[PDB]
Amino acid sequence: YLVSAMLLEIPYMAAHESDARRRMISKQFHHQLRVGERQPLLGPPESMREHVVAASKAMKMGDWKTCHSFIINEKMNGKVWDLFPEADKVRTMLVRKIQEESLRTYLFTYSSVYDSISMETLSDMFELDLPTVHSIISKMIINEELMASLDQPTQTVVMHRTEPTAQQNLALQLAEKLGSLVENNE
Amino acid sequence: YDLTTRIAHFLDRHLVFPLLEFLSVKEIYNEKELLQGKLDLLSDTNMVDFAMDVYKNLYSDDIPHALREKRTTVVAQLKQLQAETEPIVKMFEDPETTRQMQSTRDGRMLFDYLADKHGFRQEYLDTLYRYAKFQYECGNYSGAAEYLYFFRVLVPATDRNALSSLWGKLASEILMQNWDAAMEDLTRLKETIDNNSVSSPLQSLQQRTWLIHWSLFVFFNHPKGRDNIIDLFLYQPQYLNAIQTMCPHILRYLTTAVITNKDVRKRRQVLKDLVKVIQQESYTYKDPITEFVECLYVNFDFDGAQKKLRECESVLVNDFFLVACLEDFIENARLFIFETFCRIHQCISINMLADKLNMTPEEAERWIVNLIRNARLDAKIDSKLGHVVMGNNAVSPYQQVIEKTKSLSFRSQMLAMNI
Amino acid sequence: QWLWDIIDEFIYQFQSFSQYRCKTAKKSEEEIDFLRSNPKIWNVHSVLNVLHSLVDKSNINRQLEVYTSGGDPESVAGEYGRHSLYKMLGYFSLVGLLRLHSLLGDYYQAIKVLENIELNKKSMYSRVPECQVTTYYYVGFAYLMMRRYQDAIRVFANILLYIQRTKSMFQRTTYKYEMINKQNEQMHALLAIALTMYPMRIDESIHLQLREKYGDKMLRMQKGDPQVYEELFSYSCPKFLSPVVPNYDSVHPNYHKEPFLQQLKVFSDEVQQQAQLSTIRSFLKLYTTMPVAKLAGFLDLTEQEFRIQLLVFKHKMKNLVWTSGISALDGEFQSASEVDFYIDKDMIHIADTKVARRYGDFFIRQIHKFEE
Question: Is the Cβ–Cβ distance between B202 and B192 less than 8 Å?
């Protein structure tokens, strides 16, 4: 949930070539593969039902479905630490819920806010500054860092430049295998 | 890697010449003391490397430095007592015991040329065993050692004497501050370690730390000589499993060689497969100054890191070993963290950055154009604004694949119309 | 032995074929219409045409290697074996075109080139792609000679592209093709160094792997580390007036030693100032109209000490390729910045993917018709 709902959101802009096919998808395939879906009861739904609303960041919709009746369902209490496993967990949520603006909500963002972004997610400002810092050196977002002002203009305009290269995603498979047909033949 | 299967038995069960003590409790430079201490326990009984440690501080006890090496280097220890009025007159066996040799001494000091200039290999064999025992007895006697291991080398017990007396050759020549002797011994330590031995993980730890010892006190062009201490023995950051290896300047040299003479583009050696796993992380939690060279690099901070590393370089410059690289790595660390800035960042004012950088605007502006000629900053400047505009993004890169589709398979098509 | 009687055999039947090919190519049309009638195969005497022209250019230079001074070989070849076959009834083929190619082989070799007018004057005939690839090979040299690199690059990118559907495939190029390609690498590498940033033409011929190679290569030459000035011309020294390659290197003789010293001493003059003008311009167009402070602040790397900084920069500013200027009491150092885009390379490449499909059609479609 913390190495899937983050990792493959950077190549899931119709940019598939990092595919990990042993994950929640063992569940995610089958418990959206039905029609009548209301309040979750089991572990897998009561995990997936706020996973999908951790996807569309919703920073408290993602958290406060992991701390209702799980505590007696042997998630929170069952570990011989009461509020320290959740203090580990919900911190690990509050950090992977600024790293949602990173890959997800950056579309038509030309100006960006930073004081209020950590105040919104009620986290230590530096603790959510250092992973957005990580995202520049690791994820290399089409955005520009100027952190003496504590703002970043993005200039992210690949909006429909990315779709004729969605037609190149395959002209890659064209180009990959014409670098493989003679390997076949000769 | 694979050493841990057995060495879980050991965990440093070696035993060497300097056994227990290094000059005890200090005030400050508390880290340097323990990473001084353990290499001191496992290198050799030094002999102004303790005078190096005495200088910085002020205490009292200069007593167990060179006194606990009796047989040779007798002047240091004999003065040491009334140096600060120490009644340790108990010094009186060396003069009598080594004086007894003097008959055999005069015999075999001339039996030198009986084997040498005659060109004998059998009157060699006679003097060889006597010299062999003589080299272990008392050894500075770097004159005897430089005459021994230069000419025909091999010694009857090809393990014990060729190990101990050649480790004593490296000792004595370093104790007189010889470096040409140290660089032939550099290789004579490359020889003995890769002989190798019976070579239980026990004396493997001896061997790996043996090729850390000589470049602890870097003296040569070690910007070359660190490529020598980077390319041997399952070449780790440390070289041992021994997760608590307290000989840990191997990364200071790694980084020096790769940033000073080499570049860090081209850092794949130093950062990717030398760091995050186990033992760099161990020494990261040890260190106060060098911890942030990786800690605030794995945090990727933009100004806060370069500031903290400037405050770290204020005591990285407090390293007064045989350093050969103090101000070198200082301005190389500044270069590095500003490369980690320009590689990602947009553009920002010289005058305020010069407050972040501990410098002035005129130094910033020309140095930024010096980065233009470095080929590390690929951008353009303006007049005076101090706003060096970097506009690094691709322009619709499809002519790359245009070439890939045709220039191979089209040239492959005409290959078979010769029919 | 195994050299000299072969030299005689080749050169004797060369000047004997020059005889009956000069004489029966001027007035009459009897041999013409009989070589039309009997051999309809329009091949073996386009083979004779080119093969003997190449081994003539080589073997007369192999005789020149010995006869350096008062040497008959190049005189008897270059005048009667080349220029008498030149002044000819322009025959209805690639014969008259190959006669002026066969002599331009020597006329590029020996470097008395400025009737380049006459070389492209005399042929009013269809320069065949097979022959016009050789024309690009031939004329491109004459325009790197004329101190015009910016438009001599226009000649070599198209032949190392080899985009004009080149195949023959009757032993006709011949027997030295990938060495011709390797010389075409030398010429595109040559026209890249002192020009970049200007092209915008090391896209098409030289591709990303040996483009960044000749990038790292030419830019270390530009930086002023002359290891590439050294390497480029060290491996381009005979490539301007070579035979095809000299016969045999031995120890004793002085005659063989003169022509390789000759090819050294005269064209090492050309390359010395090529790498000079490269290193003079090398540095980037940072600021536009600099104040005299910023002028000198950039001459801190470019040229200082101290005196005569400004006036040796004048020696670097008068080149026809350095648009500068100094206004006195305004104190304004004006300088130009000549840029280029990249995305405008997809106008005839798109027609080339059309013709590349039609080529992929050709060979298989005649196979289909022959099989059917």
Answer: no
The closest alpha carbon to B217, from B259, B171, B263, belongs to: B171
Q: Looking at the partner chain, which of B381, B414, B416 has a beta carbon nearest the beta carbon of C286?
A: B381
DSSP A9: G
SS3 (DSSP) at C319:
coil
State the amino acid at position A76 in one-letter form.
Answer: M
Q: Which residues pair with B380 in a beta bridge?
A: B389
DSSP states along C8-60: HHHHHHHHHHHHHHHHTTSS--HHHHHHHHS----SHHHHHHHHHHHHHHHHH
Helix or strand holding residue C332 (H, E): strand C332-335
Tokens 């161990």 found at: B282
With CA atoms as reference, report the closest residue to B51 among B209, B175, B142.
B175
Chains that touch C (3 or more CB pairs under 8 A): B
Residue A52 contacts residue A9 (beta carbons within 8 Å): no
Burial A11-32 (b: 16+ CB within 10 A, else e): eeeeeeeeeeeeeeeebbeebe
Task: Give the position of tokens 């770290």.
Answer: B312
d(CA C161, CA C30) in angstroms, rounded, equals 41
List chain A residues with CB under 8 Å of B403. none
Question: How far is residue C237's CA from residue B62's CA, in Å, rounded to a whole number?
Answer: 71
- Residue B244, both tokens: 């608590």
Resolution (A): 3.5
Which chain A residues in 14-73 lie under 8 Å from chain B, judged by CB atoms? none
Residues ≥6 apart with Cβ < 8 Å to B307: B356
| CA–CA distance, A8 with A17 (Å, rounded to integer) | 10
Contact criterion met (CB below 8 Å) for B144 and B135? yes
User: How many angstroms separate the Cα of B214 from the Cα of each of A47, A116, B210, B247?
Assistant: 57, 55, 7, 11
3-state secondary structure A42-76: CHHHHHHHHHHHHHCCCCCCCCCCCCCCCCCCCCC
CA dist list (Å): B155 to A82, B124, B142: 69, 10, 17
What whole-number distance in Å separates Cα of residue B328 and Cα of residue B229?
A: 19
- Decide: A and B in contact? Rule: 3+ Cβ pairs under 8 Å: yes
CA dist B93 and B1 (Å) reads 49
Give the whole-angstrom CA distance, residue A24 versus residue A8: 13
Q: How many CB atoms lie within 10 A of CB B55?
A: 10
Using CA atoms, how far apart are residues B143 and C208, in angstroms rounded to an integer? 60
The chains in contact with chain B, meaning 3 or more Cβ pairs closer than 8 Å, are A, C
Nearest to C186 by CA among C160, C222, C219: C160
Altogether, the residues listed in chain B come to a count of 419
Closest to B50 in 3D by CA, of B89, B76, B83? B76
Q: CA-nearest residue of chain A to B391?
A: A144
Which residue in the set A134, A145, A174 is minimally distant from B345, CB to CB? A145
Minimal C-alpha gap between A177 and chain B (Å): 10
Q: Of C203, C284, C297, which has the smallest distance from its Cβ to B366's Cβ?
A: C297
Residues 6+ apart with CB under 8 A from C1: none
**A with B: how many residue pairs have Cβ under 8 Å apart?**
55
Handedness of CA B157, B158, B160, B166 (dihedral sign): positive
Distance between CA atoms of residues B379 and C199, nearest Å: 19
- Contact indicator for C289, C327 with CB cutoff of 8 Å: no
Specify burial of residue B215 (Cβ count, 10 A radius: 0-12, 13-18, 19+): buried
| Interface contact B93, partner C, CB < 8 A | no
CA nearest neighbour of B112 among B87, B140, B85, B131: B131
